[PDB]
Every structure is written in C-alpha cells, then in structure tokens.
Amino acid sequence: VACTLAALILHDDGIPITSEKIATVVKAAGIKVEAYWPALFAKLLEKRSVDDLILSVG
C-alpha cells in the first residue's frame, strides 16, 4: 500500500506520523490522495509499537 510505506519512511526519519506529514508523501509518489485514508491511517497507527510488531508475526 502507498499509505503504509508513506508512514514507514516517516518513522525511520523520527518525524511523527500524523495527517499532514503522511499526506504530502503520498502526493509525491504520484498516486492520488483520497480524503479519509491518510488521516484514518495516521490516527489508527498512532500509539502502536511498530517495532515489536515487525519482530513478531510467528
């Protein structure tokens, strides 16, 4: 997903995953922005330890 990878780069840089930051990255890729999805994902992914999740999965 374009949205998931857009979040992933922000985490690596140490810049917070919020609606403003994620949305602009999606535009840069050249895939159209659809209104609910960058905001919804940013809200949802917040307060989740992505680091532990990466290292699990069985």
């Binding site: 998931t4 994902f41 989740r48 999740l53």
Partner: protein, 262 residues
C-alpha cells in the same frame, strides 16, 4: 612525427582541441591508460570510438577549468573532486552512458602479464602442473612462493598457492617466470577511476553492478509493510488478506494450545 624535434608541440592551440570536445559531449570520463600498453590500448579504444571518440592530452589536459568555463558544466579542478590524471592518460568521451561504458571496457579486456615495479592489480596465483621448464634454477621459484620439487628430473609445481598479494610490487623475476608459465594474472584495459556525466560526479560504486545486496533491503522493506498490515485492520489493497489472518490467529491459538473442539 616528421617534426621530430622539441619545437612546437603546441600549447594553447591544442588546449582548444581538448576544450571543443568537452563542450560537445555530456560525458567526460577519466580512466587509466597508464596500465595499458599502446598496442593493447588501441583494441579497447576501437569499441569506444564508434560511440564518440577519444583524445589523449598532456598537461594542457589538467587545465579543466578553461574547458568547463567555455560551456556550462562543472567537471574541473574545483568542482570535480580531484583530476585523477596519470602518465600517458587521456580523457575518453563517449555517447554511451555511465553503466554502459563500464561494461564496454570490462567485456573486452586483453590479457597481458603483470609488469615490474607496478603494484599487482589482483592476486597472482600459480596452478599445479609441469612448469614447461627444464631443470635449471629451481631456487628462483621458491623465493617467489611458487612451490616446486624435482620429479622425473623436471621442475613441476606440487600444489597451487598464492604467489603475491594485492598492492605488493611485482618482482623482475616474478614477471619473467609468470610469462613463461603462461599466467597473465590481470587482464588489462582502461580501469575507470571516476566518471562525470550529466551534471553529476559518479564514483565507482555507481558503475559496478553488484546489487544482490540491495535485493535483500527490498525484501526487508516489504516485510515491514506486511507485519504492520496484520495488526492494523485496514482493508486497503495489500493489507486486506493480511488483516483477516490476524483474526484467524485468535481462533487458532486456543485450539492448538488446548485441545478444544469447536
């Protein structure tokens, strides 16, 4: 030439010759023709010549500032990292891209034994088998770390071993004995030290063609997406099958750990 003498071997006039070709072409590439002998050099140059042609230059060559100034680019003393010029070296201009030119020289290299007082560009190694030499100074082999013994009245190499390491100078004795054996350990041609193409300075890491390493990073990046996609509950295009399996894990977990029938 017919003007054999010291008298003019022109300066400012031949400076202009170098200038015009630089202005014409996108790529100025600097590769070391020092390593190559002249007869050998022509063979490498012949393939490159079809694209756009090469000209070799003296100390007028290092005066790259004036050449750059005439056009607009930035491949001179200042803006390029260092002019890398060596003895009997020219600047090779070619239509072929930075990746392509690397391939062009590398594919067509001509073998030659290594040369005295030059540092060996690669490891030089000796094969097992008869040397082809009659009994003589068997001592000379042993000094170089070419193992030898007399069997059947002849000098023969008992086992392969590495004669000399990279960055170490080639002996006078070493060059002679390698040539007799038929070992030509480096294959010679225009080693590319740096490339300038299209406003960019490209170091040899760009030119190479390893990768395999970069494939691993690709797989790692995708794996981070997949792991995130499991937890989140977000039925976008990739994440829609993955999230379902998270719910399946909860059902599966009780059944496997217990022995409970549902």
């Amino acid at each position: 030439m017919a003007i054999k003498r010291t008298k003019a071997e022109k300066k400012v006039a031949y400076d202009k010759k170098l200038c015009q070709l630089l202005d014409e072409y996108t790529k100025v590439l600097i590769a070391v023709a020092d390593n190559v002998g002249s007869n050998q050099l022509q063979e490498i140059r012949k393939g490159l010549r079809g694209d756009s042609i090469v000209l070799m230059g003296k100390n007028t060559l290092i005066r790259r500032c004036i050449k750059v100034h005439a056009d607009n680019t930035g491949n001179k003393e200042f803006l390029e990292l260092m002019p890398l010029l060596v003895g009997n070296v020219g600047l090779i201009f070619t239509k072929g891209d930075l990746k392509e030119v690397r391939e062009e020289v590398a594919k067509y290299k001509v073998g030659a034994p290594a040369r005295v007082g030059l540092v060996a560009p690669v490891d030089v190694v000796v094969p097992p088998g008869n040397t082809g030499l009659d009994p003589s100074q068997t001592s000379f082999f042993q000094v170089l770390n070419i193992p030898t013994k007399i069997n059947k009245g002849t000098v023969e190499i008992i086992t392969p071993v590495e004669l000399i390491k990279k960055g170490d100078k080639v002996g006078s004795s070493e060059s002679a004995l390698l040539a007799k054996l038929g070992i030509r350990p480096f294959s010679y041609g225009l080693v590319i030290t740096n490339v300038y193409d299209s406003g960019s300075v490209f170091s040899p890491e760009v030119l190479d063609l390893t990768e395999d390493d970069l494939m691993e990073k690709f797989a790692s990046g995708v794996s981070m997406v997949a792991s995130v996609s499991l937890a989140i509950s977000y039925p976008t295009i990739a994440a829609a099958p993955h999230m379902f399996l998270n719910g399946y894990k909860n059902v599966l977990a009780v059944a496997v750990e217990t022995e409970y029938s549902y």
